[PDB]
DNA sequence: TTGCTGGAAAAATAG
DNA sequence: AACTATTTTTCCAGC
């Protein structure tokens, strides 16, 4: 690498050339301290793969840096993250070089495989704030960032002592950690009239601020009757939260119904459901 | 000040002059982070006042200085609190100076107050982590002290260029803090039958691990029938716990009989009762 | 017995 | 000021 400023704007494509990422980032992705075990390197959105960049528009083996920077605007290495390297027995081998104090990762792009290289060897290490805090003042109020963007660029050099700088950023990602699925550990009731109302107490973990409480009858995907219960604002918890039994859809069922209760979180469903029966009025 | 360090050994009298501690400070006052907005003062045993220091065998103006040291032995600053001074329109003045890396707070001692003086203007801080690694040393921020003396002392100047240097600290304070009042905000049953045995989901606050139920007939400290109920401990948490209701001492009761619920926890007992009718096999 | 994570408690900050 | 709610960091425990 020629090591050009990191700070500078640069083009994704130029003299015929561009740098493509063709698989992005997952949009999230939980940083890893250095107190603690690595993380991991950063997947794609479909979890089965890695980031993916290509670079057409030219065919000999070239140096491909990757740094963590901000999350948007004109690209600068984040201030409270560091790229680093992942070893595994079958990741992609790569170097982790200092640049103007920020950490950067090469990896080879190669023609050999039409230049193209799906980016498994990269994690990301979280600074800690109050480290940080006391050199940079102007991040702390000014500016805590959880998000960063991965940094592509190649340093391709001309036919002369120039060298051409392609530079893309990936889309943001979220580098905290992930919610947790939703779950029920134990409801207070089981079993109510048709007309419903009465109140269940339920404890489990995970219930985040758009987590709704639903009450069916069956596994039907596509609408086997189901019914938002309404629950209480005034003590809602991410571990317990009550709820009031909906009526049931036939207030004159002749026979008791077996029904399913699980809840959705902003990030997914209780996949263990707990059963409720409906008795007749 | 003159700046004597702070670790040298000092006596309280000497060449006919003392400085005592007339009012100790609380045995406990909650220590807050430099973050926190909240700034209270160190108060006195009653919380009416404030920890009061007085210099006996002598009457001139000389500064007092404070600075909030170890629990006991040798006087050293405290590695893990600084004194901070806690303005008011009400409290009195001071300047907030360091010394060997340690903040010292200086109050002025005065005759026209009879060398006697309320420090109402002294708060503890609570150094992060990351901050006492800084000042004492990382092995030593592991060795955790959470209780801290405040510490007095005068450099008064004898007639020639000698300083006398009076010094006397305070009995031991608590700086953690200070454990929460347990309370019942809602129950899934209110009613069970004489022999019991059937769940109730309590919902409410600081349900710490020394905790239990008590279901009771009345308000009769000394004996009113009283009886643990059994708690669940597979879902123990601090907002909410899972009990058996206790069967009631009198199997053959004729009507229904109406008691009290409420819990202890080991720092206090839930002052806010639960009403749970008992009712005949 | 150490390394990779998912889960969390504890530490610090926000509102 | 005194609390309550969120975030950040540091710990744990299960392969």
Redo the contacts with the bound molecule.
């Keep these: 690498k020629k090591s050009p400023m990191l700070c500078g704007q640069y083009p994704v494509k130029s003299e015929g050339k561009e740098l493509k990422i063709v698989v992005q980032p997952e949009t999230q992705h939980?940083?890893?301290?250095?107190?603690?075990?690595?993380?991991?390197?950063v997947k794609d959105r479909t979890q089965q793969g890695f980031p993916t960049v290509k670079l057409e528009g030219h065919n000999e083996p070239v140096v491909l840096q990757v740094f963590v920077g901000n999350d948007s605007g004109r690209v600068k290495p984040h201030g409270?993250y560091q790229a680093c390297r992942?070893?595994?027995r079958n990741t992609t081998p790569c170097k982790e070089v200092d640049i103007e104090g920020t950490t950067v990762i090469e990896v080879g792009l190669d023609p050999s495989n039409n230049m193209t290289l799906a980016v498994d060897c990269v994690?990301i290490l979280?600074?800690?704030?109050?480290?940080?805090?006391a050199r940079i003042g102007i991040a702390?109020?000014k500016k805590?960032?959880?998000r960063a963007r991965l940094v592509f660029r190649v340093n391709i050099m001309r036919k002369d002592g120039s060298t051409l700088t392609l530079q893309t950023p990936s889309s943001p990602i979220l580098c905290?950690?992930?919610?947790?699925?939703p779950?029920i550990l134990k409801k207070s009731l089981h079993s109510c009239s048709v007309k419903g109302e009465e109140e269940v107490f339920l404890i489990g973990?995970?219930f985040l601020?758009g987590t709704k409480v639903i009450f069916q009858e069956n596994v039907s995907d596509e609408n086997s009757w189901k019914s938002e219960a309404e629950i209480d604002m005034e003590l809602?918890?991410?571990n317990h939260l009550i709820v009031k039994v909906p009526p049931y859809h036939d207030q004159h069922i002749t026979l008791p119904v077996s029904v399913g209760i699980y809840v959705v979180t902003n990030a997914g469903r209780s996949h263990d459901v707990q059963p409720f029966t409906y008795t007749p009025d």
Tied chains: 1, 2.
Aim: aromatic share 6%; net charge positive; no cysteine.
């Design positions: 939980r940083a890893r301290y250095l107190t603690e075990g690595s993380r991991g390197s409270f992942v070893t595994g994690g979280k600074l800690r704030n109050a480290d940080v805090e702390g109020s805590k960032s959880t905290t950690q992930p919610a947790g699925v779950e973990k995970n601020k809602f918890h991410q």
